[PDB]
Amino acid sequence: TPKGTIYLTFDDGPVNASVEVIKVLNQGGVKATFYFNAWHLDGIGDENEDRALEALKLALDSGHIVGNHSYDHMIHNCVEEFGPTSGADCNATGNHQIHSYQDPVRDAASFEQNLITLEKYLPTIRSYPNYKGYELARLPYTNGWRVTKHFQADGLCATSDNLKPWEPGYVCDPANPSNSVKASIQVQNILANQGYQTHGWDVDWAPENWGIPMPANSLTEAVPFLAYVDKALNSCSPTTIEPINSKTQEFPCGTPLHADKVIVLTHDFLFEDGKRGMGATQNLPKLAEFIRIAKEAGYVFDTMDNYTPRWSVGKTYQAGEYVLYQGVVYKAVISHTAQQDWAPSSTSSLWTNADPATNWTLNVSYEQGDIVNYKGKRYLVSVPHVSQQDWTPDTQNTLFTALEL
Amino acid sequence: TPKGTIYLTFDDGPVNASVEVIKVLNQGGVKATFYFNAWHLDGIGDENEDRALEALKLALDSGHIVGNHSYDHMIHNCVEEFGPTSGADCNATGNHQIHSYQDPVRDAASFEQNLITLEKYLPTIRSYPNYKGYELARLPYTNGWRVTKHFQADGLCATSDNLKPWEPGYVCDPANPSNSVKASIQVQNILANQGYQTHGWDVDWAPENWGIPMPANSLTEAVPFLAYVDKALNSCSPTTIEPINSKTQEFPCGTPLHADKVIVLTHDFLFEDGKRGMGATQNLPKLAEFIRIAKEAGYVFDTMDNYTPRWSVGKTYQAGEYVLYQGVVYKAVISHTAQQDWAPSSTSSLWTNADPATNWTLNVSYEQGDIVNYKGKRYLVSVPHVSQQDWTPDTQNTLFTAL
Ligand code: NA
Ligand code: NA
Ligand SMILES: [Zn+2]
Ligand SMILES: [Zn+2]
Secondary structure (H helix, E strand, C coil): CCCEEEEEEEEEECCHHHHHHHHHHHHCCCCCEEEECHHHCCCCCCCCCCCHHHHHHHHHHCCCEEEECCCCCCHHHCCCCCCCCHHHHHHHHCCCCECCCCCHHHHHHHHHHHHHHHHHHCCCHHHCCCECCCCEECCCCCCCEEEECCEEECCCCCCECCCCCCCCCCCCCCCCCCHHHHHHHHHHHHHHHCCCEECCCCEECCECCCCCCCHHHHECCHHHHHHHHHHHCCCCHHHHCCCHHHCCCCCCCCCHHHCCEEEEEEEHHHHCEECCEEHHHHHHHHHHHHHHHHHHHCEEECCHHHCCCECCCCCEECCCCEEEECCEEEEECCCEECCCCCCCCCCCCCEEECCCCCECCCCEEECCCCEEEECCEEEEECCCEECCCCCCCCCCCCCEEECCX | CCCEEEEEEEEEECCHHHHHHHHHHHHHCCCCEEEECHHHCCCCCCCCCCCHHHHHHHHHHCCCEEEECCCCCCHHHCCCCCCCCHHHHHHHHCCCCECCCCCHHHHHHHHHHHHHHHHHHCCCHHHCCCECCCCEECCCCCCCEEEECCEEECCCCCCECCCCCCCCCCCCCCCCCCHHHHHHHHHHHHHHHCCCEECCCCEECCECCCCCCCHHHHECCHHHHHHHHHHHCCCCHHHHCCCHHHCCCCCCCCCHHHCCEEEEEEEHHHHCEECCEEHHHHHHHHHHHHHHHHHHHCEEECCHHHCCCECCCCCEECCCCEEEECCEEEEECCCEECCCCCCCCCCCCCEEECCCCCECCCCEEECCCCEEEECCEEEEECCCEECCCCCCCCCCCCCEEEC
């Protein structure tokens, strides 16, 4: 039985480099998750991306999971007017992490636009079970988390209102986060109410040095990176990770769903021979080696659609354990062995709804102090209870108290 | 028992006229369904629409259901280049029904842009249980239907590639529909795979004559319209309705979910004092009276979120009866009484998935000849069976055969 589970996640695809990366994953006998920005398909993402559609098709046909990284990676907030050149413009200024989130509603809508463009270039995409663009997402620049009702946490210094995080004079106050960070929090919540889960990362496989020519060549080697993963295992990395803008300060250390698991973040473009260095030639062998020696050490590889285990007939669940079923998260009320007719639902007494959302819903175990949205108003939970059809916040003055607003 | 159930549906909102209509419903003690086009919120729908946001807010706060009629009512297909004036341009030419659907992928995407814009102007909209824009839709111009696996049917002469239905030389051939109609069928399928249901209508509450100086004034009066509804009840209206472009030729007459129900189609704009006539003054009284005399005649009013009854604990179901549960359609396998811990699902033994979709899914009772989509390929169902996790089409050569 294994040491733990590693989840390879690649951000910022689909681009040309993605193709060889995928092939390498297949040769290594592993699946992975790709959080995509569909603007590359439109050829305006300022990358070698003529093979974008090919790379999307390949990822899906190979059984890899596809999740939502938003349409334009929030570049519409890096410029005054978004257009075909905006990607190039933002790379010129290098202001990706400045004012990255502004209008949380418009920024949230970016993910829905991502859905549209993906289904535009590949009309059959929803026929792929491993297509999870409508369920799994990750916020650009941000190590934030919306997994369960009690497993959520934000990147409180992910983005800035002023200076870049490395510029001298940059200041990060977790207790008084930037307006950009606040906006990104709002984005998290909006996605959660739309049924999305969002995940951050435990370690980042990145250049050891971004300041040199050909920075991609400095990607940590396989063995040492495996060391970093070992240390990450059950060590609440998100709180200790560097740099400061990659931290998840209020991460619920020791939360069950996170035990024995390490989420690896990396980027497709780091594996291409191009403007960032000899990524393909130097780094593809590293990816191949890492997978080989990780399996050898007792690790298994899995994808983000399973990070929360999917409910399955015949398996025994303990009271308090979480599962994922038909897009909804549930928490076991009593220990038992699942059978055909006993699946989690809005009326099941064996399970309660534990989505990381804030809209009032059926069969949720609400605690005192909880706040839910309903029919355009906010309501404070005054009495702990399990919600039901008749007990809507606007008719239950004992359970809920309307707020001003 | 009631004589039947009427479902009032209002299309083409939200606009100024919507406000008073809603009030009339509220005064009448009834709920209704509103299929909206959000482009009015952007102020480019060529109507009195400065109170659009107020009207949407109101319909939701009043308990009315909101469904998806697409962002721009497909006006982007009525012009060469869609823009702020396109609504006006299309009303000028009157070419709405020509080339109405072209690229079905884009046209379907319109229904989704609609979601975005609605949530843009009302960020709290998803906190309304009665907001069903992502689940309930209706295609412009089209009396089409995606209800269950066995209850689907298209408006086969709804739109044209050439001539309008009144023009000389016009012919409608249900067996060889126009490219526009074909595209609209594809749109229906795409929405269904995204989890949508779509509904047509049984009668159309419209001007008796569009050719008079104030056509809105000719809206059928309460009594004669109530007669139309009496006639429509349990007599397969979609097949006999006029004009020809409002017909649903292959509508499943007698299908269980359609029994004792009449869906009324009308438009918000028909109840405004403006360019179409004295809609407010002349017609709002017709609406108010109709409700009164309808209830009196023994009808009850309900909304489209219940057209397929929602699964409820304690109720007894017969084998083959359909319910709606958490956005999915289900069919009872045997007669039973619903109980808390045994709800319809992808693993239930009491129910099978009966969504009107074409993508391969769990717990569907597949029949021989059926065609499903999976990982980019189409498969014929060679052996009838109930689907399950392990029996994916690409690994079960007995159950499925690639095309
Ligand atoms: Na979900
Ligand atoms: Na649905
Ligand atoms: Zn990124
Ligand atoms: Zn319409």
